[PDB]
Amino acid sequence: QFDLIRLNNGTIELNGILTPKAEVLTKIEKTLNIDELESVHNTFLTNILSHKLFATNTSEISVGDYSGQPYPTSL
Amino acid sequence: NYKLTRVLQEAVQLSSLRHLMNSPRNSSVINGLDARVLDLGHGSVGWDVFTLDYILYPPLSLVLNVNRPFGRKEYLRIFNFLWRF
Amino acid sequence: DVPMSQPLKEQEVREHQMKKERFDRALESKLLGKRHITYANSDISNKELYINEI
Amino acid sequence: AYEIRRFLEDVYLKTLVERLERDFNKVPNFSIRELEQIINETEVNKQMELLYNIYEEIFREIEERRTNQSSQNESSLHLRLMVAFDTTVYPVPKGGAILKIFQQKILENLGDRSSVMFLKKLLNNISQDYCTMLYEWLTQGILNDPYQEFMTYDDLERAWDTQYFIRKDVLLRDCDSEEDKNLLFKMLRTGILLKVVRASLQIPTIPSNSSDITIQEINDFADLMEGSNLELYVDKCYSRANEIFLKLFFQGYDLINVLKHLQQIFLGYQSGHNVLKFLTKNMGELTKHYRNDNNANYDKLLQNFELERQSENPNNLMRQLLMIQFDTETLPQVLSHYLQIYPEVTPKSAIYHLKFDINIPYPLNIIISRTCMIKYQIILRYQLVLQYHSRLLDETWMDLNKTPSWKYRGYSHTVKRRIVRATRVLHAKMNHFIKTIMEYFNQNVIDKEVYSLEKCYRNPTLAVAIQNELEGGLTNIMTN
């Protein structure tokens, strides 16, 4: 349940507020909506194209030493 | 001058006052037991210099007259006389 | 009759507490302090009663 | 101003018309002297003189605050309070700065029971909304302050690292003696804890059944400010706030478990095997280069750590949040910023620069402040240095009893002594010293403070008491 935010400087932190462990004082699925489903699909496709053996055509690429090239170009 | 506090804790532990120091409520009674080092000049001996005291804070310092900073210091001189014995 | 010394147990307790307090104050100072001082740079106004010139 | 206008309309103009004009139109024998007599008898002159005196006092106040522009408490630091004082002296008095004027007037009118009754009814009328705001801040932590009046206010209009301020100018008590500061900070802490409780549960208000200590509304401000009445009122509010806050943390957040995991991470408590594992997997890097060499590729260290964290328990929020870091300052130089020690007298081994930290999530950063987190971090760095040298001497004993080159019986029966026997004797002395220092530390300081803290949250009563025990334990450790 702990949705963590991780930053490029290595610093991480919980996203928002820590909810209590179902604390009760007084006395139904959790599904995904349309924008959430499209975000899930786009996240899948990005995660696949963000993988190092797919990332091409940008400056954010880390290059493989002993070739000096981006891995997908080599492959 | 700094082993004396440990000596006091141990003496309270090695005496009938240990039922008071190790009490769940009345430990504060012995919390006020402190020692004082007199000033009788050079060449003195700890026997005629060491004296016991009792550090009272309000509300009790208002009710119990102990060796107040400007009184007669009755407890101190009585303690000296009995310290001789 | 004599210039006796301050209490002993109380004296050493105070010394220990002063060590702890000095440590805590240095720690706070290193953390830019938990309390500071301010002056107010801006004031409210209401769009029902708005102004621009005299 | 509303009371002034209601006085005029309902008393001054009523007197004027229904007496003066009706006698000027219908009553023979009326005259100017009888006009002044009628004015004096209906008390309209006395009550209007009172209102005008209050107006003149407010006017002199405004004038002072307009001309006196040449102007510029440790308890807020003795407590874990990210709160500042707002020493701004506003152009017009607000709230408490005017209720104080009214109380001063009631004092200056002592003996004129009619003037005292008038001024007391004026105060009870004016301060009703202030009592409402104070009641809300004391029972629900809500700050609805659109006119910048209340004693305290939130900054920042993600949004959880809120900082409170205290408007010194609008305070009800001057905050000079010790009991006034105690009361002021008790009010502030009551509001803060109630806001935390209300923000965690994502609710807009705290139900009145959440505690057995129920608070009534302030229906007489003059009585509340009479004497110790305000102290008891704030005491009840503080008791209810602490009860609810401690219920919430110790049940909905399992703060005992969070402290247990923090002591497992930073103290080593019941977690020696994890530290040993970390060292064995990372024994080579923490001694390399005696430093970070030209921003050395110590990213492999972070990768090892994240790999281990991937195999860590998921329900352990603290180890999920543990961030291994390489600080550019050695442990002694970090300690020199608080204690009377002396720095190195050259690069020095990488474990001396290694450190850890956790961005404690809201609300858990209310009790587990950044000060106790820095204490945890320094303690963990020291414990890591000790356990690291102990692992060094362990693996040294291993190489001295597993390499046949050292077990070999020989060496001229002279070289054997002056080399191997002296080596083993010095190594044994080093091992005994290191292990004894670590034993003393761990089971006479660290264990003592863990046990004290464990004693504290056995049915506690105040959140500030738990914070005080935690910080006192870590201070007893850091000042050891």
D412: its two tokens: 């001229």
Q: How many Å apart are CA D272 and CA D256, to the nearest integer? A: 20
D141: three-class secondary structure by DSSP: coil
What residues have CB less than 8 Å from D161, skipping those under 6 apart?
D362, D365
Comparing C-alpha atoms, which of D30, D384, C5, A63 is closest to residue A73?
Answer: A63
For C23, name the nearest residue in chain D, comparing CA atoms only.
D338
Q: How many Å apart are CA D139 and CA D213, to the nearest integer? A: 11
Cβ–Cβ gap C8/B2 under 8 Å = yes
D145: its two tokens: 């302050």
Experimental method: cryo-EM
Contact between D351 and D390 under an 8 Å Cβ cutoff? The reply is no
For D167, name the nearest residue in chain C, comparing CA atoms only.
C38
Comparing C-alpha atoms, which of D300, D344, D345 is closest to residue D326?
Answer: D300
Count of CB atoms situated within 10 Å of the CB of C22: 14
Residues in chain A closer than 8 A to D320 (CB atoms): 2, 4
Report how far Cα D126 is from the mean position of its chain's Cα atoms. 32
Q: Is D141 left (phi over 0), alpha (psi -120 to 50) or beta?
A: left
What residues have CB less than 8 Å from D310, skipping those under 6 apart?
none
Residues in chain D closer than 8 A to A17 (CB atoms): 160, 199-200, 202, 361-363
Residues in chain D closer than 8 A to C28 (CB atoms): 77, 371
Inter-chain Cβ pairs, chain B and chain C, closer than 8 A: 41
D209: three-class secondary structure by DSSP: coil
D457: its two tokens: 């949250």
Instruction: Give the number of C-alpha atoms closer than 13 A to the C-alpha of residue D464, restricted to the C-beta side.
Output: 19
D164: its two tokens: 């409170």
Contact between D73 and D85 under an 8 Å Cβ cutoff? The reply is yes
Cβ–Cβ gap B55/C4 under 8 Å = no
Q: How many Å apart are CA B13 and CA B15, to the nearest integer? A: 6
Contact between C34 and C28 under an 8 Å Cβ cutoff? The reply is yes
Between the two ends of chain D, the Cα-to-Cα distance in Å is 62
Pairing of strands D152-154, A12-14: unpaired
For D79, name the nearest residue in chain C, comparing CA atoms only.
C34
- Nominal resolution in Å? 3.0
Please report all neighbours of D, defined by 3+ CB atom pairs within 8 A.
Answer: A, C
Comparing C-alpha atoms, which of B79, B83, B85, B82 is closest to residue B66?
Answer: B79
Cβ–Cβ gap D320/A19 under 8 Å = no
D23: its two tokens: 């006698």
Pairing of strands D164-167, D83-86: parallel
Count of CB atoms situated within 10 Å of the CB of D188: 19
Token pair 């010194």: residue: D168
Report how far Cα B14 is from the mean position of its chain's Cα atoms. 16
| Helices assigned H by DSSP within D403-421 | 404-407, 415
Question: Measured between CB atoms, does C16 come within 8 Å of chain B?
Answer: no
Torsion angle of C-alpha atoms D135, D136, D137, D143, degrees rounded to 10: -140
Comparing C-alpha atoms, which of D82, D463, D470 is closest to residue D249?
Answer: D463
- Helix H or strand E encompassing B45: none
Q: Which of D210, D248, D317 comes nearest A2 by C-beta?
A: D317
Question: Measured between CB atoms, does A7 come within 8 Å of chain D?
Answer: no
| Helices assigned H by DSSP within chain B | 4-13, 18-21, 27-31, 74-84
Report how far Cα D6 is from the mean position of its chain's Cα atoms. 44
Token pair 């009010």: residue: D187
Comparing C-alpha atoms, which of D447, D369, D465 is closest to residue C24?
Answer: D369
Q: What is the DSSP letter of B36?
A: E
Count of CB atoms situated within 10 Å of the CB of D325: 15
C35: three-class secondary structure by DSSP: coil
Q: DSSP string of D151-177? A: SEEES-----S--EEEEGGG-SS---S
Nearest-Cα distance to chain A for D414, in Å, is 54
Instruction: Give the number of C-alpha atoms closer than 13 A to the C-alpha of residue D296, restricted to the C-beta side.
Output: 15
Token pair 């009860």: residue: D243
Cβ–Cβ gap A14/D359 under 8 Å = yes
Q: What is the DSSP letter of B61?
A: G
| Strand ranges, E, within chain A | 4-6, 12-14
What residues have CB less than 8 Å from B59, skipping those under 6 apart?
none
Contact between D173 and D180 under an 8 Å Cβ cutoff? The reply is yes
Instruction: Give the number of C-alpha atoms closer than 13 A to the C-alpha of residue B85, restricted to the C-beta side.
Output: 4
Contact between D455 and D256 under an 8 Å Cβ cutoff? The reply is no
Phi, psi at D357, each rounded to 5°: -170, 160
Cβ–Cβ gap C38/D85 under 8 Å = yes
Q: Residue D362 corresponds to which amino acid? A: Y
A70 cis-preceded (ω within 30 degrees of 0): no
Pairing of strands B50-54, B33-37: antiparallel
Residues in chain B closer than 8 A to C14 (CB atoms): none
Q: Residue D399 corresponds to which amino acid? A: D
Helices and strands: H and E segment counts in chain B: 4, 2
A64: three-class secondary structure by DSSP: strand
Q: How far is CA D131 from CA D118, D200, D219, in A?
A: 19, 26, 8
